[PDB]
Design a protein around this nucleic acid. Structure first.
Ligand SMILES: [Mg+2]
Ligand SMILES: [Zn+2]
Lengths: 311, 230, 345, 41
DNA sequence: AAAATATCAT
DNA sequence: ATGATATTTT
């Protein structure tokens, strides 16, 4: 329950809200409120059919903000069914977010750099783009205009010359609107996050429904060496108050223990006295009351059977 | 965390929580919808049983004092069960231990010595021959009681000093050694020394004497607390 | 012991024993072996032969002849000649030998450099005090009559299996087990050893026992409360360490030989609880009155008398009659045992 | 993770491929079973 | 499990 | 010189 988990949760919520639609927020928030959600349970929670949930789950899996886990279940009174669970793998989600943010920033930076380059040329008819260097070898004999090789028609200058400021504004807007992600990423990198799996995610589980069919458990097959891709990750105190009666009792027990120890090391009888001639082996209560009454007079004068183990 | 976790009760999923602030501590499980709520007081619970870790299925059953009452809880993750099981064991053992214990259950001036009536009675009760002579010489004889103690001042002073002297201060807590289950012994003199040397323990004790819980449970909590370590 | 008390590492330690013939490949190191392996001349396996050739190959600086009281044997003398060492040291506790070969040690290894007083070390608290005793076990009339007629070699089995001796051994073990004392009962006669052990439901060690079982019994008897007493044989008479043992009995023993008596007594002279105040180990010798065992026992304890130990004769064992159960109490049981022992020869 | 490290950013994940997945006859007869094996101390 | 060589005592 | 017991090897 470290604050790092909350920070990562905030990063995921902000990223989903800012870079995904509405239903995406619903799906990812549910698996963020509940550590692991079954496919059937998720549909019931959001009241969205399978078709609607299709694009949401698939898209979130592509960006690796969510992870899937398929396991066989054996309900007591139903046919075995393969269930699907969704949970968040923080190391992958953070890495995917970091790379994607870098790519978007880099792409805009490259676009801004490219725009400053000379416009170029393009043919109006065949719509073939000619660069400044490439067009300079196509000018006619009269040195008047550039002629397209395919069409033999004058070329027309390219646009985007005046967009120089537009790209800079676009880059400025993104960085202004992406600052929370950068701050969250910096905090995440400062600390360390342990890799999450289905078993670990089940710890922070809040059951969605009273009688969900899916069993939110994990019982891997015994002695199964099979490995699947993307399925592995890196006293009581007793107190006894002693009173006078107990104190003397403890002393008596200690004395008895000492006596037993002394007797243990004592030499046998046959080793102490020379054995030769022995046969060969082969009322006061009334007095107290009258005193109490007398003293009382004084003071007045002055004034379901299963395997189990004990725990 | 240890206090709260996910569990299934009566084939219904829900959240199981442990409340220790309210005495006695109680365990309450509530369904996801909240329509179903069950509460069990740990004081009544006596024995706790858990399925072996080898078994795939995980459950915890609590059986209380009487057709004994039983309460069974099922968990999803094994780690949560261990934390819940450990905390329940601590409280169950602590409450059981308390039940076992319950089942077991100037002044030296000559003038003031003469005037000290209570001291005279205490001495006379303890001694027999002196009481016998006092009865003869003050009940039927009629000699003034005050005059009798005039000639027995040294005996009266010695008796008073036999209970008006106290041992010197010492590091009481450093003498306590716990010596898993560990037995540590305490004595009334030991309890008094702790209160005198450490007023904070006295302030904590006075509040909880009859109100929070019985005295024996206090020491078990105290020795298991970080305050004792500090 | 070498590992526990020095800086040497396993790289330089190799044991040339029957269990394993591992040899050290380091430039130099310690090699511990046994007399039989080195002394053997006629038939030795090739795998052992290579290690033996390795032993004879390099020149050694030091050679320790542990238990040097057997070197003067007919064949063990070859160990000194075969192995070439500059300095040879012999270490033994009982420099006693029935024949006149003990003096030969002075020209096989070297002069007797040093000696220590058994009594002196006992006072210093280094070796536990022992109160030796020699219990006299009378032979019953039915048993005794068969003793006289039988021949000498058959004579041994009559008094070793004396029913009175059996009762004495049972009483001493029961009495000393109450005091929480570990008891070792030596018996050179294998048949008597097994018979006593089976009746008493206690373990035993001798030649037939494998190395693994023998070690297991030794380790178990050292660290288990239930197994307080174990019987032994000639194998354990010499050169074994076991601090737990405090008491000791011998129902039967080899012919008159001071070496075995001293060695058996030494088995309980290193008790860890020797410095405790007012402690005395025990050493019991059960013999049959009027038999040849009395002659041997007197001749078998001469070395102990010279060193200082004194033997006390115990004619009567107090408290034996009150024992609820005593073996061979009924006359029928004695007769059955007499027939069983007689059928042996 | 490799691309992130090359770009100069600390990666929070690792490549899954780097993960690691992890006698002779006994003469002492009558008393063979009662005694337990105290191999070490 | 059976052979063979030593050792320790008569 | 013989008989026990122990040890090593095949
Ligand atoms: Mg030695
Ligand atoms: Zn064109």
């Amino acid at each position: 329950d470290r604050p790092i988990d909350d920070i990562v949760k905030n990063l995921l919520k902000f990223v989903v809200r800012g870079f995904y639609g509405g239903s995406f927020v619903l799906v990812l928030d549910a698996i963020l409120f509940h550590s692991v959600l079954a496919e059937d349970d998720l549909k019931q929670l959001l009241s969205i059919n399978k078709t609607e949930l299709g694009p949401l789950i698939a898209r979130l899996r592509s960006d690796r903000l969510i992870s899937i886990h398929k396991q066989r279940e054996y309900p007591p009174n139903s046919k075995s069914v393969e269930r699907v669970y969704y949970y968040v793998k923080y190391p992958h989600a953070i890495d995917a977010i970091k790379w994607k943010v870098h790519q978007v920033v880099q792409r805009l930076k490259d676009d801004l750099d490219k725009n400053s380059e000379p416009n170029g040329y393009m043919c109006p008819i065949c719509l073939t783009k000619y660069t400044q260097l490439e067009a300079v070898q196509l000018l006619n004999f009269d040195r008047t205009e550039f002629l397209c090789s395919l069409c033999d028609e004058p070329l027309v200058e390219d646009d985007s010359g005046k967009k120089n400021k537009e790209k800079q504004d676009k880059l400025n807007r993104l960085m202004d609107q992406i600052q929370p992600i950068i701050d969250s990423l910096k905090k995440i990198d400062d600390s360390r996050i342990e890799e999450n799996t289905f078993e670990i995610a089940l710890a922070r589980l809040i059951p969605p429904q009273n009688q969900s069919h899916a069993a939110y458990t994990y019982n891997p097959k015994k002695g199964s060496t099979m490995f699947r891709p993307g399925d592995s990750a890196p006293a009581t105190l007793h107190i006894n108050i002693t009173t006078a009666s107990d104190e003397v009792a403890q002393r008596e027990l200690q004395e008895r223990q000492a006596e037993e120890k002394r007797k243990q090391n004592a030499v046998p009888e046959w080793h102490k006295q020379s054995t030769i001639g022995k046969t060969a082996l082969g009322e006061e209560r009334e007095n107290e009351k009258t005193l109490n009454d007398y003293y009382a007079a004084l003071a007045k004068k002055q004034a379901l059977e299963d395997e189990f183990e004990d725990v | 965390m240890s206090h709260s976790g996910a569990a299934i009760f009566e084939k219904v999923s829900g959240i199981i929580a442990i409340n220790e602030d309210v005495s006695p501590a109680e365990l309450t499980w509530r369904s996801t919808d909240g329509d179903k709520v069950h509460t069990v007081v740990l004081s009544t619970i006596d024995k706790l049983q858990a399925t072996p870790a080898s078994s795939e299925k995980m459950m915890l059953r609590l059986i209380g004092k009487v057709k004994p009452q039983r309460h069974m809880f099922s968990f999803n993750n094994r780690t949560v069960m261990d934390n819940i099981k450990m905390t329940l064991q601590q409280i169950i053992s602590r409450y059981k231990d308390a039940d076992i214990y319950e089942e077991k259950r100037d002044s030296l001036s000559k003038e003031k010595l003469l005037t000290n009536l209570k001291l005279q009675q205490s001495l006379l009760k303890g001694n027999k021959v002196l009481m016998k002579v006092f009865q003869e010489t003050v009940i039927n004889a009629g000699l003034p009681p005050s005059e009798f103690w005039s000639t027995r001042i040294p005996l009266l002073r010695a008796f008073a000093l036999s209970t008006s002297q106290k041992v010197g201060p010492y590091n009481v807590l450093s003498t306590i050694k716990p010596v898993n289950k560990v037995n540590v012994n305490l004595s009334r003199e030991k309890i008094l020394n702790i209160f005198e040397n450490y007023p904070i323990v006295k302030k904590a004790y006075t509040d909880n004497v009859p109100k929070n819980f019985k005295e024996p449970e206090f020491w078990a909590r105290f020795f298991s607390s970080k305050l004792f370590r500090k | 012991q070498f590992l526990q008390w020095c800086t040497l590492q396993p790289e330089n330690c190799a044991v040339f024993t029957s269990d394993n013939k591992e040899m050290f490949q380091t430039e130099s190191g310690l090699v511990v072996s046994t007399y039989s392996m080195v002394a053997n001349t006629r038939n030795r396996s090739h795998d052992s032969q290579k290690v033996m050739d390795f032993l004879t190959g390099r020149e050694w600086g030091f050679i320790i002849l542990d238990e040097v009281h057997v070197v003067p044997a007919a064949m063990f003398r070859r160990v000194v000649s075969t192995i070439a060492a500059h300095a040879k040291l012999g270490l033994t506790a009982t420099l006693v030998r029935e024949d006149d070969k003990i003096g030969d040690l002075n020209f096989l290894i070297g002069p007797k450099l040093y000696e220590a007083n058994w009594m002196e070390l006992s006072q210093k608290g280094h070796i536990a005090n022992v109160q030796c005793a020699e219990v006299w076990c009378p032979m019953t009339a039915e048993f005794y009559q068969e003793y006289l007629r039988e021949t000498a070699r058959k004579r041994m089995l009559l008094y070793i299996m004396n029913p009175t001796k059996f009762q004495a051994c049972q009483f001493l073990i029961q009495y000393h087990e109450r005091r929480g004392d570990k008891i070792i009962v030596f018996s050179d006669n294998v048949y008597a050893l097994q018979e006593y052990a089976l009746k008493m439901g206690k373990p035993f060690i001798y030649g037939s026992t494998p190395q693994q079982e023998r070690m297991n019994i030794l380790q178990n008897f050292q660290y288990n409360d239930q197994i307080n007493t174990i019987f032994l044989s000639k194998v354990g008479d010499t050169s074994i360490d076991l601090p737990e043992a405090t008491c000791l009995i011998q129902i039967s023993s080899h012919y008159g030989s001071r070496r075995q008596e001293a060695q058996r007594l030494g088995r309980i002279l290193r008790a860890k609880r020797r410095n405790d105040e007012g402690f005395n180990a025990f050493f019991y010798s059960l013999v049959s009155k009027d038999t040849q065992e009395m002659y041997y026992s007197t001749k078998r304890q001469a070395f102990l008398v010279d060193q200082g130990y004194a033997f006390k004769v115990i004619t009567h064992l107090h408290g034996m009659e009150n024992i609820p159960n005593l073996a061979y109490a009924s006359p029928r049981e004695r007769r059955e045992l007499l027939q069983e022992v007689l059928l042996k020869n | 993770p490799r691309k992130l490290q090359d770009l100069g950013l600390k990666p929070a994940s690792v490549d899954p491929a780097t993960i690691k997945r992890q006698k002779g006859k006994i003469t002492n007869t009558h008393m063979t079973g009662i005694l337990k094996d105290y191999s070490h101390r």
